[PDB]
Amino acid sequence: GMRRPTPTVYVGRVPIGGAHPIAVQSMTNTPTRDVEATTAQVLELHRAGSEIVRLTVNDEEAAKAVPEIKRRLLAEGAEVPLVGDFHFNGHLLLRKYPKMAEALDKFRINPGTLGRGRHKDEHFAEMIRIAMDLGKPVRIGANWGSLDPALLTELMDRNARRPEPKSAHEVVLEALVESAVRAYEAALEMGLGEDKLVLSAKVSKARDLVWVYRELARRTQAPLHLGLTEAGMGVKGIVASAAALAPLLLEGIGDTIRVSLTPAPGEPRTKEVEVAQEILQALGLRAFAPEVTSCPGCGRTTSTFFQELAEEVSRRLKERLPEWRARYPGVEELKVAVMGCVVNGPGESKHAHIGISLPGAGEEPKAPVYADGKLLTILKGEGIAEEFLRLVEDYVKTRFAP
């Protein structure tokens, strides 16, 4: 359990907070001014499982496009909450384009991209005023890539007065937290409701992220948008995102997540959504699709045969999921095992809803299948793969019948 309690903030129809499932979100990478490209990518992300979708609203042409994007989404019955990402000129764009402001379901403010000196407080105030006027929620999202330089100096001076000064790195982290907390407190004091404020304070190193979010969670009551910013490419990005989020999520900290992956060229923007879902599912926080538990396989089993069967099982579950979702409520929780030999095969298969254990070296050429913790059958000969997937189909029909 352990979930941190928070007020509920609605982003469109999606509730965020301690009483609600942790929401997966993402961000487009098309130019927002391109209505056709951006609308298609919003739909793509939403269908992959992005419950909320953010898009940059960076200039006038972007802002003018947002109402039309929203129109086209509604025209296909797609109710996907949109978050506007504002930097530098957020106050100008919201002021000048009230239809954009109304079309968005949430505004993102970064307290480090408000402007210079005195201009900061006024810009912040205008954006919060507009959100208040329209009943919109706001994310106050700090990021250490854009840390308020005047706040850092204030905190550097406080640090230098300590009997034992902390390192420069630690003060940067202090400043990042203080940036978010101060603006949070300022928005509340201005009259913005607790039901309209989400916070983030992102850094790009996992152990720093854990420190930051523990402070945010202690010092505020807001729902928290959690992510490891600038996680990077490929396996590194995936691992770093999972490693940063897991300790916090297991502690009950975090109400919505975004995975900040750099796509490989040609790689679809949906990869980040898949990774976000896998993180939540790995930790038992949500269930999105059936999952396969499979052993690595070693010298006790024939590698090609074992690897191909596991891959075939995973492919079939993926093909059947759209249909299963529609017919079989709760099927998201399905656990299937594919195992290499007698060492752990039966035992792991018995912990799954349904599982197969192949014969390894020195074993009779037969493959026991277990369901609900006991022997269902034993398969042999050709077509082991097809016969098993039929049994999984049969199992699903019965277990997850309405």
Binding residues for its own copies restricted to 366-385, rule: CB under 8 A = none
CB 252 within 8 A of CB 3: yes
Residue 15 as a binder of its own copies (CB under 8 A): the answer is: no
Q: Which amino acid is at 132?
A: M
341 is in an annotated binding site: yes
Site for ligand F3S, residues 202 to 231, rule: CB under 6 A: none
**Minimal CB distance to ligand F3S: which residue?**
340
Residue 398 as a binder of its own copies (CB under 8 A): the answer is: no
Which residue of 361, 375, 378, 401 would you call a contact of its own copies, by CB under 8 A? 361
Measured distance CA(137)–CA(8) in Å, rounded: 11
Residue whose token pair is 């990478």 = 29
Which residue of 25, 56, 200, 220 would you call a contact of its own copies, by CB under 8 A? 56
295 is in an annotated binding site: yes
Closer CB to its own copies, 192 or 213, in the complex: 213
Q: Give the helix/strand (H/E) hosting 181.
A: helix 168-190
Site for ligand F3S, residues 299 to 358, rule: CB under 6 A: 300-301, 339-341, 343-345
Residue 293 as a binder of its own copies (CB under 8 A): the answer is: yes
| Surface-to-core class of residue 23, CB atoms within 10 Å of its CB (0-12 exposed, 13-18 middle, 19+ buried) | buried
Closer CB to ligand F3S, 165 or 299, in the complex: 299
Which residue of 195, 307, 332, 387 would you call a contact of its own copies, by CB under 8 A? 307
CB 312 within 8 A of CB 383: no
Q: What is the dihedral of CA 45, 48, 52, 58, to 10 degrees?
A: -10
Closer CB to its own copies, 33 or 72, in the complex: 33
174 is in an annotated binding site: no
Measured distance CA(238)–CA(232) in Å, rounded: 8
Measured distance CA(144)–CA(205) in Å, rounded: 11
| H-only helix segments in 76-136 | 90-96, 98-103, 118-134
386 is in an annotated binding site: no
Q: Which amino acid is at 400?
A: F
Closer CB to ligand F3S, 1 or 296, in the complex: 296
Least distance from ligand F3S to the Cβ atom of residue 89, Å: 13
For the annotated binding site for [4Fe-4S] cluster, the residues are 295, 298, 341, 348
